[model samples]
Target chain A: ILPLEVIDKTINQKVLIVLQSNREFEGTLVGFDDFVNVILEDAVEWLIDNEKVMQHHGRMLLSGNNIAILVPG
Target chain B: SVTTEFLSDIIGKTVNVKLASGLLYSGRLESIDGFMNVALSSATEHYESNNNKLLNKFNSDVFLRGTQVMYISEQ
Candidate 1:
């Protein structure tokens, strides 16, 4: 499968998304586009460097440009 | 472009992808797209600051966005 297909398969599943800024978001994968921009439901933001929760964003649209990795659990 | 051809030629080979965040991912390249987004099987994460030390190993396949990728090297 292709890269985007990996994200597609993770739709509706809980995932941990790590960003280039050393931030992370954990939530259910709600939607994504060809560019890999994603909308997460019940998203909780965290500081990847320290592994600390910064906030609960509930629902967030993450720009794919800043996204580093998608970790599906 | 020659770059695109090089990427396509490396499909299914073992590669190391370093992200802008200084995180490294090494695994078998499952697929890559025009955007350079990639899917890797048996991927292992590493920290460049830690001398590319092991950080985590994914039990499942890992997908990395192309925008954050710094470089992709064959290993």
Candidate 2:
């Protein structure tokens, strides 16, 4: 399947997303669009380099443009 | 035109993709679309600043958004 379809299968699953800024977020995939803009629930933002917890966001919307990689679990 | 064709020809091959963030991902290219969005199998994340050191390994396939991609090099 295509890349977006790969994300489509991740809906409702826990996903680890790393942004262009190097900030990482782990949360449940609540919603997304063709552009890959996502709504994440129970999101926790972290720093990937040191694996430090940055903050907790109950629900967050991430713009696809800044998204680097998405790892679905 | 030819770029798309070139990308298509590289499917299933090992490739290293560099992102605008300076992070890199190396894996087998599973698929790609017009937007440059890609699916990679057995992907490994690397930190360019850290001498391209591998940071994490994804046991399953990973999806990378097109907008953040800087380049994809076939290996």
Candidate 3:
């Protein structure tokens, strides 16, 4: 469950990533490279885009990745 | 705005304000009566971001996700 504080900022959108661990990561649009590498302010972890962690986490949950696409800032 | 009022209740505890023009005002909250007044600090710096700009004018005023806040005090 998301804290009310964050929920108060995440209007229903398609960009509020919900990680497999039940964690939520919100930020501006994410950058994806050809290799499926994503670059965000504090996130640079490779998800479904790479073979790494495949045995554990599965593909990147883009759909589940974010619950909302926050406007800038 | 209630948002500002809440923020004043929070950030008002201690804050550093920097305008786009390179002005800095560092201080403690004197009172959150209307706007908010800073007590004053020793030094300052200037920096701005469009993102911060939008955050100031955000709409919907209320929304939620699952994020956590980490806070610390110098006391």
DockQ, per model, reads 0.02, 0.02, 0.03
Model 3 DockQ, alpha carbons vs. true complex:
0.03
The 10-residue segment with the lowest total lDDT in model 1 chain B = B1-10
DockQ-derived CAPRI band for the predicted complex in model 3: incorrect
Q: Residue B23 in model 2: shift from native, Å?
A: 0.4
- For B3-42, candidate 1 gives per-residue lDDT tens digits of 4455576788887676767687878899887666889999
Ranking of candidates on lDDT, top first = 2, 1, 3
Better of 1 and 3 by lDDT: 1
The TM-score that candidate 2 achieves is 0.49
Considering only chain A, what is the TM-score of each predicted structure? 0.85, 0.85, 0.30
Alpha carbon lDDT at A13, candidate 2: 98
- Which ranges in model 3 have alpha carbons more than 4 Å from their true place? A1-73, B33-75
lDDT of 2 by residue, A1-73 (tens): 6988888789899999988765777888877776676766666656665655334334444556777899996
What's the DockQ of model 1?
0.02
Query: How do the residues B4-74 of candidate 3 rate in per-residue lDDT, one tens digit apiece?
Result: 33434443344333322323233343432222222323322222211222223212221111121110011
Clashing pairs in 2: none
Native interface contacts retained, candidate 2: 0.00
**Candidate 1 Cα misplacement greater than 4 A, ranges:** A1-73, B49-51
